Amino acid sequence: TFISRFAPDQPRKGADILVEALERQGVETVFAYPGGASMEIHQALTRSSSIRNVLPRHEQGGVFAAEGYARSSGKPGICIATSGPGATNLVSGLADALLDSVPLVAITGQVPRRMIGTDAFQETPIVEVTRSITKHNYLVMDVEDIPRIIEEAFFLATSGRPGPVLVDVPKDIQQQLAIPNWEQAMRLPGYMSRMPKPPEDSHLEQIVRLISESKKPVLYVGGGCLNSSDELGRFVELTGIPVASTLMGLGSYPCDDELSLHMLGMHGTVYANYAVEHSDLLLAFGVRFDDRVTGKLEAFASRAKIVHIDIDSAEIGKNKTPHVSVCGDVKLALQGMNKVLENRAEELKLDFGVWRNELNVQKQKFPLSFKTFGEAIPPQYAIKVLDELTDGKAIISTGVGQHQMWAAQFYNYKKPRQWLSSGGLGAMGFGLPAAIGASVANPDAIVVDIDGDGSFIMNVQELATIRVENLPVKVLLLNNQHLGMVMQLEDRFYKANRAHTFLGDPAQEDEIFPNMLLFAAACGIPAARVTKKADLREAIQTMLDTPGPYLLDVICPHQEHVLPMIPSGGTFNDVITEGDGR
Amino acid sequence: TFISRFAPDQPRKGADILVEALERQGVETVFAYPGGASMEIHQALTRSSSIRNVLPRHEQGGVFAAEGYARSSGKPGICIATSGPGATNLVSGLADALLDSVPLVAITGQVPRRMIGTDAFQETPIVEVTRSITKHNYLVMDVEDIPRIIEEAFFLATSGRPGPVLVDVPKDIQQQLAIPNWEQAMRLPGYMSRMPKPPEDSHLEQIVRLISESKKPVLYVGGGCLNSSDELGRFVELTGIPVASTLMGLGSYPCDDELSLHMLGMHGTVYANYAVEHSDLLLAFGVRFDDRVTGKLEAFASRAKIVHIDIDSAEIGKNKTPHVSVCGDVKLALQGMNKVLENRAEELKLDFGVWRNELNVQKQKFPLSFKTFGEAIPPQYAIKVLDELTDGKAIISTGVGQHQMWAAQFYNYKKPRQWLSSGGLGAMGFGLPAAIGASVANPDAIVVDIDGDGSFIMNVQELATIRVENLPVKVLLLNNQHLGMVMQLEDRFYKANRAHTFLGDPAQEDEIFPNMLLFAAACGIPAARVTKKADLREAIQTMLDTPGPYLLDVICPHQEHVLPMIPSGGTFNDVITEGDGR
Ligand SMILES: Cc1cc2nc3c(=O)[nH]c(=O)nc-3n(C[C@H](O)[C@H](O)[C@H](O)COP(=O)(O)OP(=O)(O)OC[C@H]3O[C@@H](n4cnc5c(N)ncnc54)[C@H](O)[C@@H]3O)c2cc1C
Ligand SMILES: Cc1cc2nc3c(=O)[nH]c(=O)nc-3n(C[C@H](O)[C@H](O)[C@H](O)COP(=O)(O)OP(=O)(O)OC[C@H]3O[C@@H](n4cnc5c(N)ncnc54)[C@H](O)[C@@H]3O)c2cc1C
Ligand SMILES: CCOC(=O)c1ccccc1S(=O)(=O)NC(=O)Nc1nc(Cl)cc(OC)n1
Ligand SMILES: CCOC(=O)c1ccccc1S(=O)(=O)NC(=O)Nc1nc(Cl)cc(OC)n1
Ligand SMILES: Cc1ncc(Cn2c(C)c(CCOP(=O)(O)OP(=O)(O)O)sc2=O)c(N)n1
Ligand SMILES: Cc1ncc(Cn2c(C)c(CCOP(=O)(O)OP(=O)(O)O)sc2=O)c(N)n1
Ligand SMILES: [Mg+2]
Ligand SMILES: [Mg+2]
Ligand SMILES: [Mg+2]
């Protein structure tokens, strides 16, 4: 029973209705940056005793913070901006939240309704702009539609395949007085009628049946299983099938397990790709068959009966036609298939040890390797130190690049929603703000941003947010003085011809530039720079033990390459297993 | 006669065609940030000996740099980004370039054509997103369309009412081989048929006739006159009409002149608004009748015969119906009206000294004032020092806020394209990157960014660009520790209730935060912080005399208010002439 700060018959500003609409949705943290077209909302936010605002230093940081808030908690992330330039600074976060299916609700202020379409001051058609990069969006044309639109926005952003929903609110609506009707029925008939139903035992038993007829099965787990953590583990006990995870599904099934194949795909392990390439049953649970995972579709799992479970009926048969398909929640499919596998325990000769010991051969012949030159810090080793020193129980956000792949390969995430990384859109500068949101959603957790010198500087202004809000965000900066991932593609396919990939100062090429420590200093954040591999363990330990924020500039040799690598559009018979720019 | 780096019969990559297409357009500076979907363009850029790339640290900085490059030179500004997140980071710059009519050409890489529409890696429909915030955009579907599309893009971006044109180039097109045909005819029939013709003497003489019948005329000069600098001055000699300029048209007619009324509008001078409010002839040359200038349209110049000249037929009669109108280049209209005013010199009793001395009364009764408390640096005075110490011949870019208005009121720009500021979209963080572009377009000019502690930090990462590229960008930071413009609206209309407008550290509220000097230090830029008004003159002098970049942190009392102020939707009878949050 909600307790409003206003009488049920007392007229209140539309902005006070909007904030109360968030309170009734369980919202307790928003990332709002004020502006003229949204001051009424910001005023109403201060009147709320249950909603906290984390003021960012850039709206792109605000939306990415709402993402990290959402990815690390399963709750929807809420960011607020003003009209015009404030709204356009959310675009990257919206497109990023859509491609990775992150529950997000963005509220932008808008010019008064009479001004819309007149090219007014700070007036951009943010609805017309974001329609293709949002799950849905709204334009509030009357103050009485606020309670319904907010309820539809949160429902749409969190139900089914989650995504971002934008709600444009004109300024006059925020100022208008009304008595909100909190029991309007959501005008979503066509959406709920197509919401997936619990899976039929007809399909579920044919899958269990296909598991027993199979001899080389592989699990293809992705971002759809982030809530099916326990159900996936219990399903693996009853079958013993190896688990190849995607960059989004990392943590669903523990990486430190002997049945885990870690990540598959372009920069996935040689053995996980092998298991898929020579399998007869592919259990694709909560994946979207990305080109970063399949490459050439005709060659992807070209000997396997593909069983695809997905809550989005559009993704089923989108890029690869499966044998069996189940439109629905993969959580329920596992629950149903687990009951079928217990009551048929002794009836099913379930033992794939012949298949697993074939993989464990490839597992120990082509494992994740890294060279260690002299005392230069290998970035892969630095992350493996962070894994050990944090017991693998630390929330990890990343930017985009080599340091993003090494953060995925060389860290053993034990639970989902511990790994926050931009996968679909792959947006640099995601790490630092996502660490801000995750730290606010999980105040008593170790939150570490494994950023790169390129991605880190893009939203470096959010260091002020970390200090002001007093958040224990640890920044493990893998400084290679380059845009390494673009540099690696230059070494491989363009004869190492550098085309604007060096981020330091060419006048003093042997000086680390910029001095990231002074960035932390400007925002009153303790910092340190480690250079020799011997000092690396003590440095990371200091970063963890030092309370509050901390930036650790970890210098790395820039010629390192992320391995293995399947060239885009290739097959498993092209996986590059060694090589770097030396 | 262009000299290609390739034989006329030699097949070359589509990317090499794209770069050559820029070379043939006179391009010599681009702002490209590399990514996987645009590496082919970046490789072709290095092969070019005539095109320089200024690598930004954020694509939003890259597009804003292309803006400042364009606004300070009249040339088109060219920025390049990769697919997905690189393109979405250009959105604010595109919408900003559209609202201010800035000639700009943005080139974004895109996924291969066979991949478009499959939700591929780093694939966003950047064409579908930017269609409403660009003058036009393209999607290159064949390598042979490159020479034509680039020519149409530059023509559309620079002709008529200038604007931004986006060209999305898929990756396979960049790699495909072809012999470009550099003499394709542009498929723009409907555009050129409606391109305005030189103005008829029928309209021009009726305007000159209406000038002689008028007794209280006012010039309403805006961003449309940035190229009519000399023609406007010669027109003022022949009539003696006062010149009220807009935030965009600042510099067209010198602010230090006795006939100049400086800026009109919301934060425009009390006398310039008075001249418009009690005029019988309003010569609106190159303006779009913004709400930030008119407020209540019925009350705006409600006693004047409105003569509107504009190269965009849509803006004529859009918000205020004029008596006489001329669709065409205001430059030619001035040239024609100047000839009519010379051959009719003695025939026309042109003397408005009765009208001017009525304004010079209001001019000296309600001038631009500022209080000076103790030794605290008044921001208005700091800018007036920069005016004196640079002789008013320095290129000035700004962020958005109070420091933006004071940079407009208290600086006397003597030529147009000396004042770079986001007016239509009013996008914070515009100052620092625009100073980067203007410094590259005008290497031997004094370029000074008058940024605010909020706007400056949003794109603070571009300090690395300034150092690496060795640009003499001076940063005159007006640090008030607040989002002052939003703070002022809180003091006035919300009883000084702070709603997330303080940018410093609340734990140490009397400490300047962040330490902007350390931001400059991280990027190897000399810095200094002035606090007392006595030291202010020597500090600014040091900033100017010190070669290379320089950041001057100018601390100011935060309770200052920009005055005068006409409330949004009000009239001249509501102009607030004094008051601040004390
Ligand atoms: C530089 C870089 C390199 C990359 N390389 C790789 C790589 O080598 N390997 C890799 O795996 N990724 C890689 N990616 C990440 C990538 O582009 C995609 O995010 C990833 O490949 C696909 O993720 P996914 O299909 O497993 O899950 P998602 O992309 O998150 O999609 C979720 C899917 O599950 C479904 N779903 C969601 N919820 C449920 C539910 N409750 N029940 C049932 N179904 C549900 C949705 O409908 C959707 O179809 C890379 C990214 C970058 C930036
Ligand atoms: C915080 C803030 C406060 C502001 N307050 C004010 C204020 O008090 N006063 C103010 O003036 N502005 C203010 N603005 C700026 C503002 O919103 C608009 O940019 C400005 O009001 C309108 O500019 P303009 O009409 O003079 O020219 P523009 O907006 O640049 O439009 C150009 C017009 O001229 C025409 N044109 C272009 N080229 C030619 C040509 N060659 N020949 C003929 N016509 C041509 C175009 O078709 C167009 O109609 C403020 C901005 C901000 C961020
Ligand atoms: C910028 C917000 O846009 C608007 O809301 C707006 C636009 C056009 C006309 C009237 C209004 S209004 O009267 O409804 N409110 C404002 O104009 N607020 C406002 N906010 C800021 Cl930050 C600045 C400003 O003018 C300087 N004005
Ligand atoms: C990211 C660019 O997107 C593409 O160009 C792309 C997309 C899907 C399939 C194939 C390609 S491709 O073969 O034409 N080229 C690439 O995929 N290049 C690429 N660039 C980066 Cl920076 C990373 C990457 O995979 C890690 N791949
Ligand atoms: C905003 C933006 N621009 C461009 C890209 C393209 N891109 C770029 C420029 C990469 C290199 C990132 O450099 P980094 O320093 O942040 O990380 P590493 O050098 O360790 O790989 S990876 C990648 O997909 C991007 N992902 N995001
Ligand atoms: C990216 C963005 N967000 C929000 C706004 C809204 N806004 C904001 C937040 C202003 C205050 C800017 O603070 P500042 O420190 O940069 O400048 P002053 O405090 O000197 O006015 S002015 C204004 O129109 C904006 N213009 N741009
Ligand atoms: Mg930024
Ligand atoms: Mg790097
Ligand atoms: Mg400020």
Numbering used by the authors:
A (entry chain A), B (entry chain A): 86 to 667
Could you give the paper's own sentences about this structure?
Acetohydroxyacid synthase (AHAS), also known as acetolactate synthase, is the first enzyme of the branched chain amino acid (BCAA) biosynthesis pathway, and is the target for more than 50 of these commercial herbicides. Here, we show that these mutations can have two effects (i) to reduce binding affinity of the herbicides and (ii) to abolish time-dependent accumulative inhibition, critical to the exceptional effectiveness of this class of herbicide.
Next, the crystal structure of the W574L mutant in complex with CE was determined. In the WT complex, the pyrimidine makes π–π interactions and a halogen–π interaction with the indole moiety of W574. This change is the main factor accounting for the 70-fold loss of affinity of CE for this mutant compared to the WT enzyme. In comparing the structures of the WT and W574L complexes, the most striking difference is a rotation of 38° in the dihedral angle that connects the heterocyclic ring of CE to the sulfonylurea bridge. For the chlorine atom to make an optimal hydrophobic interaction with the side chain of leucine, it is forced towards the region where ThDP is located. Importantly, the position adopted by the chlorine atom in the W574L mutant has the potential to impede accumulative inhibition imposed by CE.
